[PDB]
Design an enzyme around this catalytic site. Structure first.
Site, PDB file in Angstrom:
ATOM      1  N   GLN A 265       0.824  -1.200   0.000  1.00  0.00           N
ATOM      2  CA  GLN A 265       0.000   0.000   0.000  1.00  0.00           C
ATOM      3  C   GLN A 265       0.856   1.247   0.000  1.00  0.00           C
ATOM      4  OE1 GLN A 265      -2.788  -1.788   3.330  1.00  0.00           O
ATOM      5  NE2 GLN A 265      -3.688   0.072   2.440  1.00  0.00           N
ATOM      6  N   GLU A 266       0.252   2.389  -0.335  1.00  0.00           N
ATOM      7  CA  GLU A 266       0.945   3.682  -0.366  1.00  0.00           C
ATOM      8  C   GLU A 266       2.316   3.620  -1.030  1.00  0.00           C
ATOM      9  OE1 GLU A 266      -0.359   6.425   0.380  1.00  0.00           O
ATOM     10  OE2 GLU A 266      -2.177   5.757   1.252  1.00  0.00           O
ATOM     11  N   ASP A 267       2.331   3.024  -2.217  1.00  0.00           N
ATOM     12  CA  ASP A 267       3.505   2.855  -3.056  1.00  0.00           C
ATOM     13  C   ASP A 267       4.598   1.964  -2.475  1.00  0.00           C
ATOM     14  OD1 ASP A 267       2.409   4.599  -4.997  1.00  0.00           O
ATOM     15  OD2 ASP A 267       2.985   6.251  -3.803  1.00  0.00           O
ATOM     16  N   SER A 268       4.240   1.085  -1.544  1.00  0.00           N
ATOM     17  CA  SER A 268       5.196   0.110  -1.058  1.00  0.00           C
ATOM     18  C   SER A 268       5.112  -1.118  -1.950  1.00  0.00           C
ATOM     19  CB  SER A 268       4.938  -0.232   0.389  1.00  0.00           C
ATOM     20  OG  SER A 268       3.708  -0.872   0.539  1.00  0.00           O
TER      21      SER A 268
END
Lengths: 123, 49
Positions: B2-5
């Protein structure tokens, strides 16, 4: 277009006013027992080492862009002389030190007293 | 993820996936600003320097 004689003539105009005010005792009637005041100039040439380095200072320091009358510029005036007076530096690297060496060793055998003439404590 | 991970395969990474080399250069010189004043490259010591 201007001659020395004109400048001289001006100097003459002032100089020659001081006749009755100038007092001068001369040794023409005093110096009755002394030798001939002899003089000459020695012609010492630069070594490959010395010649190259005083020129190298002039080539690499770029004094005219530093501007003139600056410390290293003015030091240059003395440095170019120091190439033979110092350099920092066995005397084999200095024509002057070799000339002095030869003259003093000559006079060593001659038994002559001699003066050295230098205007500097560092020297 | 999530959140560009991101989640990655470690064993593929272990296999050398996306590794790269890194290079860097240095440079220097001796006698700089001083007439007959040569700085020099030479192995130092606290009593020698």
């Amino acid at each position: 277009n201007i001659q020395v004689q004109t400048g001289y003539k001006c100097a003459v105009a002032l100089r020659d006013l001081i006749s009755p005010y100038l007092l001068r005792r001369v040794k023409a009637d005093v110096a009755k027992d002394l030798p001939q005041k002899k003089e000459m100039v020695l012609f010492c040439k630069l070594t490959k080492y010395q010649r190259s380095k005083y020129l190298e200072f002039l080539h690499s320091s770029d004094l005219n862009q530093i501007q003139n009358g600056k410390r290293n510029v003015l030091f240059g005036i003395d440095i170019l002389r120091k190439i033979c007076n110092h350099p920092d530096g066995d005397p084999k690297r200095s024509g002057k030190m070799q000339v002095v060496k030869q003259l003093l060793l000559l006079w060593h055998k001659q038994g002559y007293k001699a003066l050295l003439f230098t205007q500097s404590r560092q020297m | 993820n999530q959140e560009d991970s991101m989640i990655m395969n470690q064993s593929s990474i272990d296999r050398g996936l996306f590794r790269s080399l890194f290079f860097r250069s240095y440079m220097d010189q001796e006698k700089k600003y001083g007439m007959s004043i040569t700085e020099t490259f030479e192995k130092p010591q606290r009593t020698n320097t």
